[PDB]
Nucleic acid binder design. Structure first.
Ligand SMILES: [Mg+2]
Ligand SMILES: [Mg+2]
Ligand SMILES: [Mg+2]
Ligand SMILES: [Mg+2]
Ligand SMILES: [Mg+2]
Ligand SMILES: [Mg+2]
Ligand SMILES: [Mg+2]
Ligand SMILES: [Mg+2]
Ligand SMILES: [Mg+2]
Ligand SMILES: [Mg+2]
Ligand SMILES: [Mg+2]
Ligand SMILES: [Mg+2]
Ligand SMILES: [Mg+2]
Ligand SMILES: [Mg+2]
Ligand SMILES: [Mg+2]
Ligand SMILES: [Mg+2]
Ligand SMILES: [Mg+2]
Ligand SMILES: [Mg+2]
Ligand SMILES: [Mg+2]
Ligand SMILES: [Mg+2]
Ligand SMILES: [Mg+2]
Ligand SMILES: [Mg+2]
Ligand SMILES: [Mg+2]
Ligand SMILES: [Mg+2]
Ligand SMILES: [Mg+2]
Ligand SMILES: [Mg+2]
Ligand SMILES: [Mg+2]
Ligand SMILES: [Mg+2]
Ligand SMILES: [Mg+2]
Ligand SMILES: [Mg+2]
Ligand SMILES: [Mg+2]
Ligand SMILES: [Mg+2]
Ligand SMILES: [Mg+2]
Ligand SMILES: [Mg+2]
Ligand SMILES: [Mg+2]
Ligand SMILES: [Mg+2]
Ligand SMILES: [Mg+2]
Ligand SMILES: [Mg+2]
Lengths: 172, 48, 170, 119, 116, 46, 203
RNA sequence: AGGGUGAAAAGAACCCCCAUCGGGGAGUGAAAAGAACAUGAAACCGUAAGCUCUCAAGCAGUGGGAGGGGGACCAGACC
RNA sequence: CGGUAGGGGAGCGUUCCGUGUUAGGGAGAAACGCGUGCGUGAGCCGCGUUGGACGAAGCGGAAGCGAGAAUGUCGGCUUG
């Protein structure tokens, strides 16, 4: 079926007491980074948000180890996002009988860790082939093995997708 | 003085991105510092 | 069955190996061999040669507009009243007949020239929104218009030969 | 019998919004704005279906002018056209402009006919 | 502006900043090493060295000048014992400053000032 | 100053363009000889 | 650093595949020189005869265009500048399009010998304004022509070019030199046709 | 002012991250519907993929459409 | 066969009632999302890797029956 089933662990923190903007400031830096680098960075960052985000990422790495069997060395943070949570309002008095509204923003954070090495067989093997060679090699195998070969990250990384549907190499 | 209008979506996204870029320079300092404490050779620095 | 096998193997065993989906049986056909070129012809076809048409074109008047018609091609016009699908019409207003050896220029019309066409369809055009609006007078009117249209195919341009040609002859 | 307005509103709105796809900014978001923007769109559209007919004639005439001015030192659009008419040819301006770009030799021929007869 | 104004303000008025510095140096001489903010450290150097250089001479005059800086007598006497022993050959420069991880509460840069 | 200006429609009356010259007024569309009768637009061939 | 890793290799190869197949089935370009009504290939294509011809990318490409030289000595400023504007704009080609640059390059040489009628040499006034108040500056035509004479013809032609993006981009096609010599000999300039009667002044 | 997890609490044993909260597996269940739980529009906040903006003046559209991309079966069309 | 104030003619839709404990519907209803479909338009007809139990058409009836403006109003969410 899809790459998302093979490579991915998803972890949601719910209701962290960071406001979405603050937390975003940290999450933008760790997007696309090796799990190692992201660790040490998040240990030494000045921001407050860094600590909850840290607990989160450590967790998601543990999940990829103990659940789906991945190597921690090969984890990168592939997709990370922060969405707004439930806002708690409180009213405080101002000068001269006026009030004002304080919001105590929460957030959900979603980190999606993605193994690099998984698929590497098909990956490098398909890199090995020139563009003609590959089409000659795919002239043998049934619809089954075609779909099984090319179901790696390959078609996306090199941007072949709409080309191969045009070469009649596939069915949708 | 007040805001005669409301700030348009895209411009606001640009200003807040500017404020998010400081996170980029902070992440660089943090990385360099980590690689300095990761050799245990610094006599100017201390951790416990 | 190789789909079920490789999917049950990518299901059961996580981290798939290349040797299982593609066995060591297939070397691929050599890049210079006929068995290579049949496949590479199938999947990457060479552009086929263009269909033959006459080298000729006419300029004909239909519904008081003037079209350039080349044979084998279909054009859109005003509905022709009392035309049915699969009708052989002849267009008799022909201003200009070009050929790459000749050009016939009517005064006004090329005499005896006829353009044989066949009415392939009767349509309604892409709906145009006619919209009448006046600010502050609180008046807007939304009205669609679909024009009836006739889609016809030019087959041949004939009966010019006798008429005097001119040429650029240097 | 109480009647909530229900979906009758949001269908209308949604069908309007479909129109306004690819409008920059809040012309693609807020319904209230989107309304106006829809009207103005439809309006300009109507206007320029009329401008169009003016404009291509503009164009064609211009191209014809250029195409002829190449031949004689003294020759114009005006002179040409006048001669097309006193020779009784019906070719309109779209056609002479298209034959000007796409078959330039043809227009040279036409000019040679007009001259021969005006001679 | 300030051109050539060399003093460390520590964001306190004169009175408080004096008292602060007296305090911090009695702490340094009592414990031998301490943890503070980089600013406070860099400022504290001068007065540490003043006390040390003071005790190298030992006269009743000098000792009275130290007593009127440091807060606790005991520390002063200890100084006028220890220093000729420990620092006799060191001509100036008696403090190490080893900086650390910043503070959690405010992100104030920290540091470790040692009596060397 | 004892003279006024021309505001609004007054000004338009004054300034709008006019051909005064008797020769340009009396002009007109060119007279072209009639066309020979033209054939039938489109005929049905059965 | 250009990575020669199998990945980027692969990608470039593939992209030349896409480009190859897109080139083979696409309709060929036939330039406009004795270009007859249609090629047997276009005949399968869209309808280009019953719509107005609009230029495609292969046409206007900068490297093609004509170059012209105007010797401006004893020419009359305005009358020449109109000609120049026409050619730069492209209004003299059958292929003219308002939205595109079909024009030529024009090289003006001897820009200090350009001639002007009547008292203009001393009367005509080139003004430019700082943007501060009291910031107005004025030159007579002659002060200008002794100081930086190219600016006179640039300033007269830029007036007659369209204004706005295409206008400015057009204005770069006007190359002006004060001496009788231009360093464009490589571009093989043709001379400029002038159909005006009054453009040549005689003393 | 604050209504609607499921038919039934069967309200999630056990392992992992783990100071708790929170989560990921396993297990329950027709479905996770997972307790802030039933359909879940808009504003608003983002994330990814396609095309594109840093000489530019503009109620932001519209008629013309360069170049680039996408899903087709009337492949000359549509987006 | 331009059109404001304004008058007349012809229609569409919403919820409910009659036909009706209707036709149809866990072989997926309402709703929600989509359309190279059809209307002068209000809208209709078709479609769904959403949704989980109702409910058309026709021929009629009734109204808490159609919203962008009320410094309207109540919730939600922005801007600063
Ligand atoms: Mg009070
Ligand atoms: Mg207040
Ligand atoms: Mg009114
Ligand atoms: Mg009700
Ligand atoms: Mg109501
Ligand atoms: Mg658009
Ligand atoms: Mg302060
Ligand atoms: Mg005091
Ligand atoms: Mg005090
Ligand atoms: Mg000193
Ligand atoms: Mg006056
Ligand atoms: Mg005026
Ligand atoms: Mg007149
Ligand atoms: Mg659990
Ligand atoms: Mg505890
Ligand atoms: Mg728990
Ligand atoms: Mg489970
Ligand atoms: Mg089960
Ligand atoms: Mg819900
Ligand atoms: Mg500029
Ligand atoms: Mg630019
Ligand atoms: Mg601009
Ligand atoms: Mg009327
Ligand atoms: Mg009225
Ligand atoms: Mg209905
Ligand atoms: Mg209904
Ligand atoms: Mg109902
Ligand atoms: Mg029933
Ligand atoms: Mg349905
Ligand atoms: Mg209902
Ligand atoms: Mg319906
Ligand atoms: Mg109905
Ligand atoms: Mg049920
Ligand atoms: Mg009924
Ligand atoms: Mg009511
Ligand atoms: Mg409202
Ligand atoms: Mg409100
Ligand atoms: Mg805000």
């Amino acid at each position: 079926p899809e790459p998302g089933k093979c490579d991915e662990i998803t972890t949601r923190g719910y209701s962290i007491s960071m406001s979405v903007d603050k937390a975003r400031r940290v999450i933008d830096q760790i997007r696309g980074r090796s799990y190692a680098e992201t660790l040490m960075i998040l240990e030494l960052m000045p921001y407050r948000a860094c600590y909850p985000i840290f607990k989160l990422i450590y967790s998601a790495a543990a999940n990829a180890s103990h659940n789906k069997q991945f190597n921690k060395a090969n984890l990168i943070i592939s997709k990370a996002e922060v969405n707004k949570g439930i806002t708690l309002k409180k009213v405080k008095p101002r000068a001269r009988g006026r009030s004002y509204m304080i919001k105590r923003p929460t957030c959900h954070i979603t980190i999606v860790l993605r193994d690099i090495t998984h698929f590497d067989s098909y990956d490098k093997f398909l890199e090995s082939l020139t563009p003609k060679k590959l089409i000659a090699l795919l002239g043998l195998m049934s619809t089954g093995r075609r779909r099984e070969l090319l179901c790696g990250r390959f078609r996306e990384n090199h941007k072949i997708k709409s080309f191969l549907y045009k070469i009649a190499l596939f069915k949708r | 003085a007040v805001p005669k209008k409301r700030t348009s979506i895209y411009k606001k996204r640009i200003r807040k991105n500017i404020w998010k870029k400081k996170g980029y320079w902070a992440a660089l300092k943090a990385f360099s510092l980590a690689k300095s404490l990761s050799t245990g050779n610094s006599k100017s620095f201390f951790v416990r | 069955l190789k789909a079920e096998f490789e999917e049950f193997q990518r299901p059961p065993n996580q981290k798939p190996q290349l040797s299982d989906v593609l066995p060591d049986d297939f070397q691929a056909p050599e890049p210079g061999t006929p068995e290579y070129n049949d496949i590479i012809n199938q999947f990457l076809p060479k552009k086929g040669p263009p269909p033959p048409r006459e080298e000729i074109f006419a300029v004909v008047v239909i519904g008081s507009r003037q079209y350039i018609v080349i044979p084998g091609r279909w054009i859109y016009t005003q509905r022709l009243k009392g035309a049915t699908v699969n009708d052989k019409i002849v267009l008799n207003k022909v201003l200009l007949v070009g050929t790459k050896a000749s050009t016939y220029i009517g005064t006004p019309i090329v005499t005896n020239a006829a353009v044989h066409a066949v009415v392939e369809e009767q349509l309604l055009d892409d709906k145009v929104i006619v919209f009448k609006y006046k600010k502050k007078k609180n008046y807007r009117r939304n009205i669609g218009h679909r024009q009836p249209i006739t889609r016809i195919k030019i087959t041949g341009i004939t009966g010019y030969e006798d008429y005097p040609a001119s040429t650029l002859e240097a | 019998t109480r009647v909530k307005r229900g979906y009758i509103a949001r269908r209308r709105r949604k069908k309007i919004r479909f129109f306004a796809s690819s409008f920059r900014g809040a012309h693609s978001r807020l319904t209230r704005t989107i309304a106006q923007q829809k009207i103005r769109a439809l309006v300009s559209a109507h206007r320029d279906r009329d401008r169009q007919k003016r404009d291509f004639r503009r164009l064609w005439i211009t191209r014809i002018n250029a195409a002829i001015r190449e031949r004689g030192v003294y020759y114009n659009y005006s002179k040409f056209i006048h001669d097309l008419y006193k020779r009784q040819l019906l070719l309109n301006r779209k056609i002479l402009a298209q034959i000007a770009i796409l078959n330039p030799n043809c227009i040279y021929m036409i000019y040679n006919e007009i001259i021969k007869k005006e001679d | 502006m300030k051109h050539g104004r060399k003093i460390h303000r520590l964001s306190r008025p004169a009175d408080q900043r004096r008292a602060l510095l007296r305090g911090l140096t009695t702490q340094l001489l009592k414990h031998g090493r301490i943890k503070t903010t980089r600013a406070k450290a860099s400022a504290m150097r001068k007065y540490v060295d003043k006390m040390i250089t003071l005790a190298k001479e030992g006269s009743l005059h000098k000792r009275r000048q130290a007593l009127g800086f440091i807060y606790e007598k005991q520390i002063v006497h200890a100084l006028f014992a220890e220093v000729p022993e420990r620092y006799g050959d060191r001509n100036g420069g008696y403090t190490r400053i080893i900086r650390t991880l910043p503070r959690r509460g405010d992100n104030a840069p920290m540091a470790y000032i040692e009596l060397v | 100053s004892s003279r006024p200006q021309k505001k609004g429609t007054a000004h338009h009356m004054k300034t709008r363009p006019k051909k005064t010259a008797r020769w340009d007024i009396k002009r007109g569309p060119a007279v072209y000889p009639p066309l020979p009768p033209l054939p039938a637009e489109w005929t049905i061939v059965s | 650093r250009k990575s020669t890793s199998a990945s980027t290799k692969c990608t470039e190869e593939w992209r030349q595949l896409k480009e190859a197949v897109k080139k083979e089935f696409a309709i060929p370009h036939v330039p406009l020189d004795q270009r007859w009504m249609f090629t047997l290939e276009e005949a399968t294509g869209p309808d280009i005869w019953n719509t107005t011809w609009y230029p495609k990318s292969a046409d206007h490409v900068p490297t093609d265009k004509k170059w012209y030289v105007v010797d401006a000595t004893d020419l009359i400023l305005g009358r020449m500048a109109s000609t120049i504007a026409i050619h730069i704009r492209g209004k003299n080609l059958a292929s003219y399009t308002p939205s595109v640059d079909m024009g030529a390059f024009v090289i003006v040489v001897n820009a200090d010998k350009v001639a002007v009628s009547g008292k203009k040499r001393t009367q005509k006034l080139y003004r430019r304004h700082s943007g501060r108040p009291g910031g107005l500056k004025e030159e007579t035509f002659d002060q200008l022509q002794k100081r930086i004479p190219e600016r006179i013809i640039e300033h007269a032609v830029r007036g007659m070019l369209p204004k706005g993006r295409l206008g400015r981009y057009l204005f770069n096609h006007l190359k002006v030199y004060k001496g009788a010599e231009h360093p464009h000999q490589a571009q093989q300039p043709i001379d400029l046709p002038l159909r005006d009667k009054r453009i040549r002044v005689e003393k």
